[PDB]
PDB file of C-alpha atoms and ligand atoms in Angstrom:
ATOM      1  CA  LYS A   1      35.033  40.203  84.075  1.00 14.20           C
ATOM      2  CA  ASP A   2      35.869  39.613  81.352  1.00 12.47           C
ATOM      3  CA  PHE A   3      37.409  42.067  79.083  1.00 15.53           C
ATOM      4  CA  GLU A   4      35.534  40.998  76.161  1.00 14.71           C
ATOM      5  CA  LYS A   5      32.156  41.552  77.935  1.00 14.91           C
ATOM      6  CA  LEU A   6      33.277  44.713  79.460  1.00 12.37           C
ATOM      7  CA  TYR A   7      34.357  46.016  76.260  1.00 10.19           C
ATOM      8  CA  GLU A   8      31.012  45.013  74.608  1.00 11.12           C
ATOM      9  CA  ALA A   9      29.210  46.787  77.436  1.00 11.07           C
ATOM     10  CA  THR A  10      31.240  49.921  76.859  1.00 13.04           C
ATOM     11  CA  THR A  11      30.615  49.901  73.172  1.00 15.98           C
ATOM     12  CA  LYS A  12      26.887  49.369  73.603  1.00 15.73           C
ATOM     13  CA  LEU A  13      26.790  52.203  76.178  1.00 12.54           C
ATOM     14  CA  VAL A  14      28.553  54.545  73.728  1.00 11.28           C
ATOM     15  CA  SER A  15      26.479  53.415  70.429  1.00  7.88           C
ATOM     16  CA  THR A  16      23.239  53.868  72.437  1.00  7.38           C
ATOM     17  CA  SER A  17      24.175  57.184  73.766  1.00  6.19           C
ATOM     18  CA  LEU A  18      25.001  58.491  70.161  1.00  5.79           C
ATOM     19  CA  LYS A  19      21.883  56.988  68.646  1.00  3.77           C
ATOM     20  CA  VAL A  20      19.878  58.577  71.446  1.00  2.62           C
ATOM     21  CA  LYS A  21      21.313  62.155  70.964  1.00  2.00           C
ATOM     22  CA  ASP A  22      21.179  61.813  67.272  1.00  2.00           C
ATOM     23  CA  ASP A  23      17.755  60.689  66.832  1.00  4.06           C
ATOM     24  CA  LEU A  24      16.301  63.459  69.252  1.00  6.59           C
ATOM     25  CA  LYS A  25      18.182  66.056  67.133  1.00  6.27           C
ATOM     26  CA  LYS A  26      16.639  64.619  64.067  1.00 10.33           C
ATOM     27  CA  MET A  27      13.130  64.700  65.536  1.00  7.93           C
ATOM     28  CA  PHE A  28      13.664  68.431  66.540  1.00  5.34           C
ATOM     29  CA  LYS A  29      14.658  69.181  62.901  1.00  5.55           C
ATOM     30  CA  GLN A  30      11.772  67.301  61.403  1.00  2.77           C
ATOM     31  CA  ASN A  31       9.401  69.595  63.398  1.00  6.16           C
ATOM     32  CA  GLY A  32      11.273  72.532  62.218  1.00  2.24           C
ATOM     33  CA  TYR A  33      13.431  73.239  65.187  1.00  2.00           C
ATOM     34  CA  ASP A  34      17.184  73.484  64.481  1.00  2.00           C
ATOM     35  CA  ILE A  35      18.468  72.519  68.027  1.00  2.00           C
ATOM     36  CA  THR A  36      20.699  69.895  69.389  1.00  2.00           C
ATOM     37  CA  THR A  37      20.257  67.683  72.397  1.00  2.00           C
ATOM     38  CA  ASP A  38      23.011  69.864  74.052  1.00  2.00           C
ATOM     39  CA  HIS A  39      20.669  72.994  73.530  1.00  2.00           C
ATOM     40  CA  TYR A  40      17.717  71.107  74.947  1.00  3.11           C
ATOM     41  CA  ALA A  41      19.525  70.041  78.154  1.00  3.22           C
ATOM     42  CA  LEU A  42      20.778  73.523  78.737  1.00  2.00           C
ATOM     43  CA  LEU A  43      17.382  74.901  78.167  1.00  5.14           C
ATOM     44  CA  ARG A  44      15.779  72.459  80.613  1.00  4.63           C
ATOM     45  CA  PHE A  45      18.117  73.687  83.348  1.00  5.88           C
ATOM     46  CA  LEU A  46      16.943  77.229  82.667  1.00  4.52           C
ATOM     47  CA  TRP A  47      13.253  76.446  82.353  1.00  6.73           C
ATOM     48  CA  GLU A  48      13.752  75.179  86.069  1.00  3.62           C
ATOM     49  CA  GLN A  49      15.942  78.094  87.127  1.00  2.00           C
ATOM     50  CA  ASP A  50      16.643  81.152  85.120  1.00  2.75           C
ATOM     51  CA  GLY A  51      19.764  83.386  85.793  1.00  2.00           C
ATOM     52  CA  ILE A  52      21.969  80.394  86.307  1.00  2.51           C
ATOM     53  CA  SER A  53      25.708  81.475  86.386  1.00  2.00           C
ATOM     54  CA  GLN A  54      27.780  80.157  83.558  1.00  2.00           C
ATOM     55  CA  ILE A  55      30.024  78.327  86.001  1.00  2.00           C
ATOM     56  CA  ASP A  56      26.923  76.968  87.591  1.00  2.00           C
ATOM     57  CA  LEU A  57      25.952  75.673  84.052  1.00  2.00           C
ATOM     58  CA  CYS A  58      29.643  74.259  83.750  1.00  2.00           C
ATOM     59  CA  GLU A  59      29.063  72.116  86.806  1.00  2.00           C
ATOM     60  CA  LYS A  60      25.495  71.103  85.871  1.00  2.00           C
ATOM     61  CA  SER A  61      26.321  70.422  82.205  1.00  2.00           C
ATOM     62  CA  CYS A  62      29.626  68.551  82.258  1.00  2.00           C
ATOM     63  CA  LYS A  63      31.735  69.412  79.237  1.00  2.00           C
ATOM     64  CA  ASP A  64      34.781  71.407  79.451  1.00  2.00           C
ATOM     65  CA  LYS A  65      34.500  75.316  80.063  1.00  2.00           C
ATOM     66  CA  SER A  66      35.528  75.643  76.436  1.00  2.00           C
ATOM     67  CA  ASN A  67      32.472  73.359  74.958  1.00  2.00           C
ATOM     68  CA  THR A  68      29.739  74.646  77.166  1.00  2.00           C
ATOM     69  CA  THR A  69      30.638  78.270  76.410  1.00  2.00           C
ATOM     70  CA  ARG A  70      30.613  77.528  72.666  1.00  2.00           C
ATOM     71  CA  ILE A  71      27.353  75.703  72.884  1.00  2.00           C
ATOM     72  CA  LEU A  72      25.956  78.841  74.999  1.00  2.00           C
ATOM     73  CA  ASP A  73      27.274  81.289  72.142  1.00  2.00           C
ATOM     74  CA  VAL A  74      25.501  79.139  69.613  1.00  2.00           C
ATOM     75  CA  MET A  75      22.236  79.454  71.629  1.00  2.00           C
ATOM     76  CA  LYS A  76      22.489  83.178  72.254  1.00  2.00           C
ATOM     77  CA  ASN A  77      23.061  83.511  68.397  1.00  2.00           C
ATOM     78  CA  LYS A  78      19.833  81.533  67.781  1.00  2.00           C
ATOM     79  CA  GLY A  79      18.052  83.933  70.013  1.00  2.00           C
ATOM     80  CA  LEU A  80      17.266  81.602  73.040  1.00  2.00           C
ATOM     81  CA  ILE A  81      19.348  83.062  75.921  1.00  2.00           C
ATOM     82  CA  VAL A  82      21.286  86.175  76.782  1.00  2.00           C
ATOM     83  CA  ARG A  83      24.258  86.629  78.788  1.00  2.00           C
ATOM     84  CA  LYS A  84      24.647  89.388  81.452  1.00  2.00           C
ATOM     85  CA  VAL A  85      27.585  90.501  83.496  1.00  2.00           C
ATOM     86  CA  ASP A  86      26.513  89.836  87.074  1.00  2.00           C
ATOM     87  CA  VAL A  87      25.159  92.049  90.058  1.00  2.00           C
ATOM     88  CA  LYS A  88      27.537  90.219  92.460  1.00  2.00           C
ATOM     89  CA  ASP A  89      30.635  90.001  90.430  1.00  2.00           C
ATOM     90  CA  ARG A  90      31.955  91.584  87.220  1.00  2.00           C
ATOM     91  CA  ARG A  91      33.787  88.249  86.777  1.00  2.00           C
ATOM     92  CA  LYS A  92      30.758  85.983  86.438  1.00  2.00           C
ATOM     93  CA  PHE A  93      28.295  85.868  83.682  1.00  2.00           C
ATOM     94  CA  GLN A  94      24.517  85.231  84.489  1.00  2.00           C
ATOM     95  CA  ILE A  95      22.319  83.282  81.787  1.00  2.00           C
ATOM     96  CA  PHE A  96      18.857  84.346  81.117  1.00  2.00           C
ATOM     97  CA  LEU A  97      16.042  83.027  78.779  1.00  2.00           C
ATOM     98  CA  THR A  98      14.756  85.294  76.063  1.00  2.00           C
ATOM     99  CA  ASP A  99      11.165  85.256  75.348  1.00  2.00           C
ATOM    100  CA  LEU A 100      11.974  82.860  72.474  1.00  2.00           C
ATOM    101  CA  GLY A 101      13.713  80.743  75.104  1.00  2.00           C
ATOM    102  CA  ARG A 102      10.629  80.591  77.312  1.00  2.00           C
ATOM    103  CA  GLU A 103       8.369  79.927  74.212  1.00  2.00           C
ATOM    104  CA  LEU A 104      10.071  76.682  73.202  1.00  2.00           C
ATOM    105  CA  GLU A 105       9.337  74.847  76.567  1.00  2.00           C
ATOM    106  CA  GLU A 106       5.923  73.376  75.627  1.00  2.00           C
ATOM    107  CA  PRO A 107       6.832  72.387  72.161  1.00  2.00           C
ATOM    108  CA  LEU A 108      10.351  71.223  72.751  1.00  2.00           C
ATOM    109  CA  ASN A 109       9.173  69.136  75.793  1.00  2.00           C
ATOM    110  CA  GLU A 110       6.352  67.802  73.495  1.00  2.00           C
ATOM    111  CA  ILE A 111       8.794  66.465  71.011  1.00  2.00           C
ATOM    112  CA  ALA A 112      11.128  65.208  73.526  1.00  2.00           C
ATOM    113  CA  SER A 113       8.028  63.209  75.216  1.00  2.00           C
ATOM    114  CA  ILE A 114       7.216  61.642  72.096  1.00  2.00           C
ATOM    115  CA  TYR A 115      10.761  60.584  71.325  1.00  2.00           C
ATOM    116  CA  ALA A 116      11.126  59.193  74.817  1.00  2.00           C
ATOM    117  CA  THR A 117       7.923  57.147  74.931  1.00  2.00           C
ATOM    118  CA  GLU A 118       8.957  55.487  71.678  1.00  2.00           C
ATOM    119  CA  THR A 119      12.572  55.032  72.528  1.00  2.00           C
ATOM    120  CA  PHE A 120      11.768  53.253  75.895  1.00  2.00           C
ATOM    121  CA  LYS A 121       8.839  51.419  74.757  1.00  2.00           C
ATOM    122  CA  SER A 122      10.605  47.964  75.284  1.00  2.00           C
ATOM    123  CA  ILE A 123      11.724  48.625  78.712  1.00  2.00           C
ATOM    124  CA  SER A 124       9.663  48.448  81.868  1.00  2.00           C
ATOM    125  CA  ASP A 125       9.273  51.159  84.319  1.00  2.00           C
ATOM    126  CA  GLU A 126      10.920  48.880  87.086  1.00  2.00           C
ATOM    127  CA  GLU A 127      13.866  48.422  84.849  1.00  2.00           C
ATOM    128  CA  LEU A 128      14.732  52.288  84.984  1.00  2.00           C
ATOM    129  CA  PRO A 129      16.079  52.519  88.507  1.00  2.00           C
ATOM    130  CA  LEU A 130      18.107  49.574  87.998  1.00  2.00           C
ATOM    131  CA  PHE A 131      19.622  50.909  84.823  1.00  2.00           C
ATOM    132  CA  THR A 132      20.202  54.276  86.370  1.00  2.00           C
ATOM    133  CA  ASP A 133      21.885  52.815  89.465  1.00  2.00           C
ATOM    134  CA  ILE A 134      24.267  50.700  87.217  1.00  2.00           C
ATOM    135  CA  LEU A 135      25.144  53.932  85.315  1.00  2.00           C
ATOM    136  CA  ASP A 136      25.764  55.805  88.526  1.00  2.00           C
ATOM    137  CA  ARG A 137      28.260  53.118  89.502  1.00  2.00           C
ATOM    138  CA  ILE A 138      30.064  52.984  86.317  1.00  2.00           C
ATOM    139  CA  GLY A 139      33.417  54.887  86.575  1.00  4.46           C
TER     140      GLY A 139
ATOM    141  CA  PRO B   1       1.918  57.645  70.804  1.00  6.19           C
ATOM    142  CA  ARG B   2       0.178  55.744  73.619  1.00  4.67           C
ATOM    143  CA  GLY B   3      -0.873  52.717  75.721  1.00  7.18           C
ATOM    144  CA  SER B   4      -2.465  52.020  79.224  1.00  6.16           C
ATOM    145  CA  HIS B   5       0.953  52.022  81.124  1.00  3.83           C
ATOM    146  CA  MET B   6       3.036  55.204  80.299  1.00  2.24           C
ATOM    147  CA  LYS B   7       6.207  56.140  82.131  1.00  4.29           C
ATOM    148  CA  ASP B   8       6.979  59.329  83.510  1.00  5.38           C
ATOM    149  CA  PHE B   9       8.793  61.641  81.059  1.00  3.00           C
ATOM    150  CA  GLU B  10      10.928  63.052  83.998  1.00  2.00           C
ATOM    151  CA  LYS B  11      12.228  59.619  84.596  1.00  2.00           C
ATOM    152  CA  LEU B  12      12.936  58.793  81.041  1.00  2.00           C
ATOM    153  CA  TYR B  13      14.774  62.006  80.739  1.00  2.00           C
ATOM    154  CA  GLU B  14      16.948  61.567  83.571  1.00  2.00           C
ATOM    155  CA  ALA B  15      17.844  58.258  82.488  1.00  2.00           C
ATOM    156  CA  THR B  16      18.632  59.484  79.080  1.00  2.00           C
ATOM    157  CA  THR B  17      20.884  62.210  80.725  1.00  2.00           C
ATOM    158  CA  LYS B  18      22.753  59.725  82.787  1.00  2.00           C
ATOM    159  CA  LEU B  19      23.160  57.599  79.897  1.00  2.00           C
ATOM    160  CA  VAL B  20      24.789  60.388  77.934  1.00  2.00           C
ATOM    161  CA  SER B  21      26.973  61.800  80.724  1.00  2.00           C
ATOM    162  CA  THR B  22      28.116  58.332  81.524  1.00  2.00           C
ATOM    163  CA  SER B  23      28.984  57.538  77.897  1.00  2.00           C
ATOM    164  CA  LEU B  24      30.901  60.726  77.843  1.00  2.00           C
ATOM    165  CA  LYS B  25      32.768  60.286  81.132  1.00  2.00           C
ATOM    166  CA  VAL B  26      33.799  56.750  80.063  1.00  2.00           C
ATOM    167  CA  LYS B  27      35.097  57.827  76.672  1.00  2.00           C
ATOM    168  CA  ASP B  28      37.035  60.772  78.045  1.00  2.00           C
ATOM    169  CA  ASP B  29      38.776  58.935  80.757  1.00  2.00           C
ATOM    170  CA  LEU B  30      39.839  56.155  78.460  1.00  2.00           C
ATOM    171  CA  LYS B  31      41.437  58.784  76.337  1.00  2.00           C
ATOM    172  CA  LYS B  32      43.229  60.402  79.132  1.00  2.00           C
ATOM    173  CA  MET B  33      44.560  57.076  80.286  1.00  2.00           C
ATOM    174  CA  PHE B  34      46.074  56.254  76.795  1.00  2.00           C
ATOM    175  CA  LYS B  35      47.749  59.680  76.744  1.00  2.00           C
ATOM    176  CA  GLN B  36      48.956  59.388  80.161  1.00  2.00           C
ATOM    177  CA  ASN B  37      50.613  56.297  79.294  1.00  2.00           C
ATOM    178  CA  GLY B  38      52.212  57.554  76.174  1.00  2.00           C
ATOM    179  CA  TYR B  39      49.626  56.821  73.411  1.00  2.00           C
ATOM    180  CA  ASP B  40      47.785  59.810  71.603  1.00  2.00           C
ATOM    181  CA  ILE B  41      44.767  57.779  70.654  1.00  2.00           C
ATOM    182  CA  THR B  42      41.037  58.475  71.013  1.00  2.00           C
ATOM    183  CA  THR B  43      38.534  56.003  71.943  1.00  2.00           C
ATOM    184  CA  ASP B  44      37.155  56.187  68.413  1.00  2.00           C
ATOM    185  CA  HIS B  45      40.576  55.367  67.079  1.00  2.00           C
ATOM    186  CA  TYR B  46      40.784  52.512  69.548  1.00  2.00           C
ATOM    187  CA  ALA B  47      37.429  51.266  68.613  1.00  2.00           C
ATOM    188  CA  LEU B  48      38.336  51.038  64.939  1.00  2.00           C
ATOM    189  CA  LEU B  49      41.662  49.399  65.618  1.00  2.00           C
ATOM    190  CA  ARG B  50      39.744  46.809  67.533  1.00  2.00           C
ATOM    191  CA  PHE B  51      37.673  46.010  64.295  1.00  2.00           C
ATOM    192  CA  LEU B  52      41.005  45.833  62.356  1.00  2.00           C
ATOM    193  CA  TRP B  53      42.925  43.463  64.837  1.00  2.00           C
ATOM    194  CA  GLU B  54      39.799  41.182  64.392  1.00  2.00           C
ATOM    195  CA  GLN B  55      39.647  41.587  60.616  1.00  2.00           C
ATOM    196  CA  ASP B  56      42.606  43.192  59.027  1.00  2.00           C
ATOM    197  CA  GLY B  57      41.911  44.247  55.352  1.00  2.00           C
ATOM    198  CA  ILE B  58      37.928  44.662  55.833  1.00  2.00           C
ATOM    199  CA  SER B  59      36.103  46.887  53.440  1.00  2.00           C
ATOM    200  CA  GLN B  60      35.736  50.666  54.395  1.00  2.00           C
ATOM    201  CA  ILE B  61      32.080  49.723  53.660  1.00  2.00           C
ATOM    202  CA  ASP B  62      31.827  46.929  56.222  1.00  2.00           C
ATOM    203  CA  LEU B  63      33.859  49.019  58.608  1.00  2.00           C
ATOM    204  CA  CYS B  64      30.929  51.740  58.554  1.00  2.00           C
ATOM    205  CA  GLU B  65      28.239  49.021  59.181  1.00  2.00           C
ATOM    206  CA  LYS B  66      30.165  47.898  62.278  1.00  2.00           C
ATOM    207  CA  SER B  67      31.387  51.489  63.080  1.00  2.00           C
ATOM    208  CA  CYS B  68      28.160  53.296  63.199  1.00  2.00           C
ATOM    209  CA  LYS B  69      29.226  56.810  62.579  1.00  2.00           C
ATOM    210  CA  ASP B  70      27.662  55.992  59.430  1.00  2.00           C
ATOM    211  CA  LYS B  71      30.002  57.400  56.625  1.00  2.00           C
ATOM    212  CA  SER B  72      31.690  60.829  56.515  1.00  2.00           C
ATOM    213  CA  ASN B  73      32.627  60.524  60.217  1.00  2.00           C
ATOM    214  CA  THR B  74      34.161  57.085  60.146  1.00  2.00           C
ATOM    215  CA  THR B  75      35.968  58.286  57.075  1.00  2.00           C
ATOM    216  CA  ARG B  76      37.178  61.700  58.500  1.00  2.00           C
ATOM    217  CA  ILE B  77      38.369  59.467  61.497  1.00  2.00           C
ATOM    218  CA  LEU B  78      40.044  56.974  59.071  1.00  2.00           C
ATOM    219  CA  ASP B  79      41.933  59.741  57.424  1.00  2.00           C
ATOM    220  CA  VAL B  80      43.188  60.968  60.792  1.00  2.00           C
ATOM    221  CA  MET B  81      44.283  57.354  61.520  1.00  2.00           C
ATOM    222  CA  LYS B  82      46.036  57.195  58.076  1.00  2.00           C
ATOM    223  CA  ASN B  83      48.016  60.332  58.913  1.00  2.00           C
ATOM    224  CA  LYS B  84      48.785  58.897  62.263  1.00  2.00           C
ATOM    225  CA  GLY B  85      50.435  55.890  60.363  1.00  2.00           C
ATOM    226  CA  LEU B  86      48.113  53.335  61.859  1.00  2.00           C
ATOM    227  CA  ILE B  87      46.267  52.259  58.861  1.00  2.00           C
ATOM    228  CA  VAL B  88      46.432  52.367  55.185  1.00  2.00           C
ATOM    229  CA  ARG B  89      43.788  52.532  52.480  1.00  2.00           C
ATOM    230  CA  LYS B  90      44.084  50.095  49.517  1.00  2.00           C
ATOM    231  CA  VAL B  91      41.840  50.091  46.554  1.00  2.00           C
ATOM    232  CA  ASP B  92      40.000  46.829  46.201  1.00  2.00           C
ATOM    233  CA  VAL B  93      41.439  44.375  43.773  1.00  2.00           C
ATOM    234  CA  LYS B  94      38.007  42.901  43.407  1.00  2.00           C
ATOM    235  CA  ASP B  95      35.091  45.233  43.096  1.00  2.00           C
ATOM    236  CA  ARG B  96      35.963  48.654  41.749  1.00  2.00           C
ATOM    237  CA  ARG B  97      35.755  51.717  43.792  1.00  2.00           C
ATOM    238  CA  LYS B  98      35.688  49.877  47.252  1.00  2.00           C
ATOM    239  CA  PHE B  99      38.447  50.191  49.457  1.00  2.00           C
ATOM    240  CA  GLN B 100      40.158  47.680  51.943  1.00  2.00           C
ATOM    241  CA  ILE B 101      41.640  49.092  55.251  1.00  2.00           C
ATOM    242  CA  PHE B 102      44.862  47.356  56.537  1.00  2.00           C
ATOM    243  CA  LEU B 103      46.908  48.012  59.572  1.00  2.00           C
ATOM    244  CA  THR B 104      50.365  49.458  59.453  1.00  2.00           C
ATOM    245  CA  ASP B 105      53.165  47.899  61.470  1.00  2.00           C
ATOM    246  CA  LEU B 106      52.540  50.453  64.122  1.00  2.00           C
ATOM    247  CA  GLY B 107      48.752  49.586  63.915  1.00  2.00           C
ATOM    248  CA  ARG B 108      49.555  45.953  64.519  1.00  2.00           C
ATOM    249  CA  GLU B 109      51.895  46.479  67.266  1.00  2.00           C
ATOM    250  CA  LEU B 110      49.630  48.646  69.359  1.00  2.00           C
ATOM    251  CA  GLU B 111      47.265  45.797  69.929  1.00  2.00           C
ATOM    252  CA  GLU B 112      48.902  44.478  72.923  1.00  2.00           C
ATOM    253  CA  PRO B 113      49.767  47.884  74.894  1.00  2.00           C
ATOM    254  CA  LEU B 114      46.415  49.348  74.027  1.00  2.00           C
ATOM    255  CA  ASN B 115      44.335  46.335  75.121  1.00  2.00           C
ATOM    256  CA  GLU B 116      46.314  46.242  78.328  1.00  2.00           C
ATOM    257  CA  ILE B 117      45.453  49.687  79.142  1.00  2.00           C
ATOM    258  CA  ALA B 118      41.709  49.384  78.120  1.00  2.00           C
ATOM    259  CA  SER B 119      41.596  46.139  80.077  1.00  2.00           C
ATOM    260  CA  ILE B 120      42.768  47.562  83.275  1.00  2.00           C
ATOM    261  CA  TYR B 121      40.692  50.671  82.668  1.00  2.00           C
ATOM    262  CA  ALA B 122      37.530  48.518  82.018  1.00  2.00           C
ATOM    263  CA  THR B 123      38.050  46.497  85.246  1.00  2.00           C
ATOM    264  CA  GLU B 124      38.272  49.664  87.359  1.00  2.00           C
ATOM    265  CA  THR B 125      35.374  51.212  85.778  1.00  2.00           C
ATOM    266  CA  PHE B 126      33.091  48.193  86.184  1.00  2.00           C
ATOM    267  CA  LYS B 127      34.561  47.090  89.593  1.00  2.00           C
ATOM    268  CA  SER B 128      31.201  47.945  91.423  1.00  2.00           C
ATOM    269  CA  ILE B 129      29.179  45.993  88.904  1.00  2.00           C
ATOM    270  CA  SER B 130      28.423  42.428  89.540  1.00  2.00           C
ATOM    271  CA  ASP B 131      28.620  39.665  87.062  1.00  2.00           C
ATOM    272  CA  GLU B 132      24.855  39.220  87.011  1.00  2.00           C
ATOM    273  CA  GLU B 133      24.174  42.766  86.356  1.00  2.00           C
ATOM    274  CA  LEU B 134      26.195  43.062  83.206  1.00  2.00           C
ATOM    275  CA  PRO B 135      24.151  41.301  80.629  1.00  2.00           C
ATOM    276  CA  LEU B 136      21.048  42.777  82.259  1.00  2.00           C
ATOM    277  CA  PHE B 137      22.575  46.245  81.474  1.00  2.00           C
ATOM    278  CA  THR B 138      23.737  45.289  78.262  1.00  2.00           C
ATOM    279  CA  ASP B 139      20.136  43.864  77.378  1.00  2.00           C
ATOM    280  CA  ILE B 140      18.507  47.079  78.284  1.00  2.00           C
ATOM    281  CA  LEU B 141      20.939  49.022  76.039  1.00  2.00           C
ATOM    282  CA  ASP B 142      19.866  46.725  73.184  1.00  2.00           C
ATOM    283  CA  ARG B 143      16.195  47.350  73.716  1.00  2.00           C
ATOM    284  CA  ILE B 144      16.540  51.175  73.885  1.00  2.00           C
ATOM    285  CA  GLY B 145      15.462  52.306  70.368  1.00  2.00           C
TER     286      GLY B 145
HETATM  287 HG1  LIG C 201      31.736  54.047  68.308  1.00  2.00          HG
HETATM  288 HG1  LIG C 202      24.425  66.154  78.230  1.00  2.00          HG
HETATM  289 HG1  LIG C 203      33.262  73.228  83.208  1.00  2.00          HG
HETATM  290 HG1  LIG C 204      33.428  55.230  56.179  1.00  2.00          HG
END
């Protein structure tokens, strides 16, 4: 409708995504926090709700089970989260924030806010839900 | 940074999240479709091949400007393409130390079957999206950043 246009949209979608992820990461680094966008998204779920099951974070995350688990080990190794074997299943892992994990909410949210305002500055508030809804119908 | 009409951070974050997820789903599904139909090609590969079908023998340098993925990642990906037999690296006759990138016979032949799959894929993927909506979507993506 027509392929050339469709391919161009797909490309822009995919550049933009990468640029977004990559600039937010840089901004966390510049302020001295060595974290990725993936780590931030995961931590956001936990700040809402601590003790999420790993499978539960599969679902919410996306990824494969391989990738998510590797991202979570990187996070544990930076001290943000710990991993417990569950009180309603040996099979399941529950995921808890450390103190470090809790502490970073204010500041990581602050940097993400600053990134967001600048990044979305040319776009109107009323364009968001259109954008969002077009993304939701893609696929 | 500020003004008199700020957006809600939550909304911006949700949009960023949806943008990211959707990018990933689209990439990953296109890759699955290529493999299911017998071609072991990533979306990154296919995207580079598109640039080569338009402009065979382009410089590594000019490929990176178009590519994004600024240098070491386009390169690593180019290497993987050479070892797949899709492309070939040729020292520039003019301008020392530049390379030009050329399609193999295999890389040329893939143009038709790979565009066929991607095209079908794109139409499915965008079927719920009206003709008026598309450049709107595209224009928002251009203003992001
Ligand atoms: Hg790309
Ligand atoms: Hg994500
Ligand atoms: Hg999963
Ligand atoms: Hg390169």
